[PDB]
Enzyme design. Structure first.
Site, PDB file in Angstrom:
ATOM      1  N   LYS A   1      -8.263 -18.469  -6.910  1.00 46.14           N
ATOM      2  CA  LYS A   1      -8.610 -17.114  -6.486  1.00 46.14           C
ATOM      3  C   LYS A   1     -10.117 -16.903  -6.465  1.00 46.14           C
ATOM      4  O   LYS A   1     -10.711 -16.575  -7.495  1.00 46.14           O
ATOM      5  CB  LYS A   1      -7.980 -16.066  -7.407  1.00 46.14           C
ATOM      6  CG  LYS A   1      -6.463 -16.038  -7.398  1.00 46.14           C
ATOM      7  CD  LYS A   1      -5.934 -14.966  -8.343  1.00 46.14           C
ATOM      8  CE  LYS A   1      -4.455 -15.179  -8.650  1.00 46.14           C
ATOM      9  NZ  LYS A   1      -3.959 -14.278  -9.733  1.00 46.14           N
TER      10      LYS A   1
ATOM     11  N   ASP B   1       0.454  -0.460  -9.761  1.00 44.86           N
ATOM     12  CA  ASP B   1       1.194  -0.924  -8.597  1.00 44.86           C
ATOM     13  C   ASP B   1       2.121  -2.085  -8.939  1.00 44.86           C
ATOM     14  O   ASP B   1       1.718  -3.250  -8.929  1.00 44.86           O
ATOM     15  CB  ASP B   1       0.231  -1.319  -7.487  1.00 44.86           C
ATOM     16  CG  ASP B   1       0.800  -1.052  -6.116  1.00 44.86           C
ATOM     17  OD1 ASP B   1       1.958  -1.451  -5.862  1.00 44.86           O
ATOM     18  OD2 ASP B   1       0.102  -0.423  -5.297  1.00 44.86           O
TER      19      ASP B   1
END
Ligand SMILES: [Zn+2]
Lengths: 286, 45, 37, 127, 135
Positions: A122, A213
């Site tokens: 990432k 979320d």
RNA sequence: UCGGUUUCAAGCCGAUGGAAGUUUGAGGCAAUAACAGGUCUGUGAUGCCCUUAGACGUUCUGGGCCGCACGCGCGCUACACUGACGGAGCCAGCGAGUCUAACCUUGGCCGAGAGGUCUUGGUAAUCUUGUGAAACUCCGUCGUGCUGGGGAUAGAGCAUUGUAAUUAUUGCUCUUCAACGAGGAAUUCCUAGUAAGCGCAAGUCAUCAGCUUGCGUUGAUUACGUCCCUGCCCUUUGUACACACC
């Protein structure tokens, strides 16, 4: 974007000089030619200028000749390959190349190590490029942040990808043979998996976090066996996380739970019998 | 032992030890290319 | 191919003229096509 | 059976009658015509069948025409069809009628995606 | 139209041709439930058996069920031409058939095993398909 | 034209009149100083490798370009009852179309359809064609049930284009009816005959779109604000860090 290949064109010297521009742009804005000549700790114009020609040809550096003010500009690729070189030195990454996960402030590739164990990369791209100090700096701080959050998530037992390394704005993580709530069709023990996914939000609000979320694509599910069917509930959520003191923690938590129950209601037709955990119980739990 | 190599000794700067587990089964149609045979006994675990 | 510049590419094969768009844009004024709007 | 008729009756039936019993595809394919080259091929074929040791297998015939429909004249024949690289000996059965030869000669190898090990070493090297 | 009221008479769930048919849907879409028969086929079959389809499936006698099952097995003798049928011009027998609910699957297996025994591209791709996707 | 506003100066803005008054609104034309940008199948005893058994030339078959855990993106069709189906009403514009060839095609017969067959008009403001387009209008069936919404996938047949359709060109008939109960982080596009819904024509075109560009049909909601972010600038100002000290 990222073309990792080109990195194996560079020698000891080209990395040496690129490092010198990295120490020279974090000290002054636009690093001139003599700064690179004197800081690099090199011999002559031979090595440094040949190195810089290599870097400039391979788009790791840009020549800024502003009315006699000659200088250089490190592109994102340069930073990439310096983090990646630091990792080549720290024996953490050995090969790269398969893109699964095109986020807004994060790029996710598939990598490998010395031993052949698959992993994930990432990198963080804030603004993707009109490079100032803030883009690179805040991407660096971004991956620092997410790696520390990740380390505290692996440490405390949570089923979250084990953070291996945080080379600047780039982070090496564990590859997880999992599938998101979209790609998943049916489960052998859906109530146990719901119990798990609720107990997790309970323990997360017990730690002090509310991952605002918690949708379907967020939750990965790793399979360990095919005969006995072993599941593992991985969750990717850190910059969207919201602490348990913020004014708005309530409907965030209860949105997470309502989404858990609404998906478990639609896709697997399994409604929860016990009442959903409210914010208050978890406000006392921490 | 250079006999225990599937690629050139350069493992320090090269690719990774690629493993080629060969699951060869024999198809019994009389006279058949290696391709058809590569597409008759394909197993996945 | 474009009957002007040895080009397989750009061909306006319409109406039997067969000029690639680059050359046809140049020869446009000699053919009859002019800039009105 | 091919239309509900005994195998010998059909085998001993001309291509026009096989066209009379065929689906639309074959009838239109043959009513539009055929090239002169297979006329040689179809002899080669039968030559093999006519020099064959009894109660075994006849001589194989290598083919390139993957577009030729199987007509009862060629049943029992061992045929080495070209896939683009290699020949494949397929013995013509009573069931293969109406079909193109190329269907019995796959044009490619399968895509084996289930190999993460060789996929973690088919990566771009970072060194 | 006419509000006509009948005390009882109608059954809730019936069965014909060893398949389950539910009786409150119109007869077309009650016969569509089975395999081998769709909206259009049940429409034509219930125009052939001279059954009123505007009357629901709870208003049908067994005398109409016997005509329906009759037209199921003789669709070319009640004047439903060969265009209307699933399996027409069979290679095995040279006739025209309309296959029913439990026989469509057996015909499917017959077809795919025909292509597998011959060894066509369809057979190999189908089996290697199911195998590798399932495994 | 009248009135605000501006040194009451070139102008700005509101109202009125006006076919039309944000510069009623779109884009082409220069000189200028920057380009190792594309090729000329331009030329000159010009520097390279050889010089030729190399195939950079030809051909001939058959395979490819689609092959599928997936990532990314432009889309098409959908989750219905301001709806689907079945009956009738029936309204456009931009085009295009055949010769030393077979293009656009009315009409009459055959066919469930797709299509076939016998003719015909037009090289076209004259024929196709009033392109009798669809959304839409009206009268019916269904009734909220993954339903009769959706039409994926798959089976068998029938035809067309093509020398050739298998990995299915496409069209037609019956059958299979998968996912999808207004969709997370996020993000694109838009101020009037405009968005959106709707189809048609032309380019590719031998067969096709879900491709593109126009066209007409139906036709809203919401501003007419601001520099909040996005940028783009143009000022003012301190200054190269005039490479200041650590
Ligand atoms: Zn040209």
């Amino acid at each position: 974007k990222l073309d990792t290949s080109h990195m194996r064109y560079l020698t000891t010297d080209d990395f040496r000089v690129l490092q010198a521009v990295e120490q020279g742009s974090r000290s002054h804005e636009v690093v001139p030619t003599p700064l690179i000549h004197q800081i690099s700790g090199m011999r002559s114009q031979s090595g440094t200028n040949r190195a810089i020609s290599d870097l400039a040809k391979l788009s790791l550096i840009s020549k800024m000749r502003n009315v006699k003010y000659d200088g250089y500009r490190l592109t994102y690729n340069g930073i990439d390959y310096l983090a990646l070189k630091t990792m080549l030195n720290r024996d953490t990454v050995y090969s790269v190349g398969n893109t699964i996960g095109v986020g807004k402030e994060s790029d996710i590739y598939k990598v490998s190590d010395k031993n052949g164990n698959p992993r994930v990369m990432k990198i963080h791209r804030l603004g993707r490029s009109n490079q100032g100090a803030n883009w690179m700096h805040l991407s660096r701080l971004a991956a620092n942040k997410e790696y520390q959050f990740m380390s505290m998530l692996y440490s405390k037992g949570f089923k979250v990808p084990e953070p291996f390394d945080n080379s600047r704005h780039i982070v090496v993580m564990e590859l997880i043979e999992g599938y998101p709530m979209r790609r998943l069709r049916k489960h052998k023990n859906i109530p146990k998996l719901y119990s798990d996914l609720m107990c997790f939000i309970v323990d997360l609000a017990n730690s002090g976090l509310i991952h605002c979320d918690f949708n379907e694509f967020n939750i990965m599910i790793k399979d360990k066996l095919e005969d006995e069917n072993d599941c593992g509930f991985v969750v990717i959520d850190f910059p969207q996380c919201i602490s348990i003191q913020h004014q708005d923690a309530d409907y965030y938590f209860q949105r997470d739970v309502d989404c858990i129950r609404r998906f478990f209601k639609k896709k697997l037709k399994y409604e929860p019998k016990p009442d959903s955990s409210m914010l208050d119980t978890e406000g006392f739990g921490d | 032992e250079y006999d225990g190599l599937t690629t050139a000794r350069y493992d320090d700067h090269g690719f990774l030890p690629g493993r080629e587990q060969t699951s060869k089964k024999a198809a019994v149609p009389k006279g058949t290319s290696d391709y058809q045979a590569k597409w008759y006994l394909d197993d996945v675990i | 191919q474009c009957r002007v510049c040895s080009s397989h590419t750009g061909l306006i094969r319409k109406y039997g003229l067969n000029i690639c768009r680059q050359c046809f844009r140049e020869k446009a004024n000699d053919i009859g096509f002019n800039k009105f709007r | 059976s091919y239309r509900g008729v005994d195998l010998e009756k059909l085998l001993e039936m001309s291509t026009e009658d096989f066209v009379k019993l065929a689906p639309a595809r074959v009838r239109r394919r043959f009513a539009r015509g055929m090239t002169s080259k297979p006329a040689g091929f179809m002899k080669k074929l039968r030559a093999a069948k006519l020099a064959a040791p009894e109660n075994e297998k006849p001589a194989p015939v290598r083919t390139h025409m993957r577009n030729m429909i199987i007509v009862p004249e060629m049943i029992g024949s061992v045929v080495g069809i070209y896939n683009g690289k290699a020949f494949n000996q397929v013995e013509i059965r009573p069931e293969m009628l109406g079909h193109y030869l190329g269907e019995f000669s796959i044009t490619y190898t399968p895509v084996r995606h289930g190999r993460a090990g060789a996929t973690t070493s088919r990566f771009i090297p970072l060194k | 139209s006419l509000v006509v009221q009948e005390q009882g008479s109608f059954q809730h769930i019936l069965r014909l041709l060893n398949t389950n048919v539910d009786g409150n849907i119109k007869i077309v879409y009650a016969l569509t439930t089975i395999k081998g028969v769709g909206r259009r086929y049940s429409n034509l079959v219930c125009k052939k058996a001279d059954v009123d389809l505007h009357k629901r499936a709870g208003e049908l006698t067994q005398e109409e069920l016997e005509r329906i099952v009759q037209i199921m097995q003789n669709p070319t003798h009640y004047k439903i031409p060969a265009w209307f049928l699933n399996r027409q011009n069979d290679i095995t027998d040279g006739k025209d058939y309309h296959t029913l609910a439990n026989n469509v699957e057996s015909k499917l297996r017959d077809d795919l095993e025909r292509l597998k025994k011959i060894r066509a591209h369809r057979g190999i791709r189908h089996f290697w398909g199911l195998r590798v996707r399932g495994q």
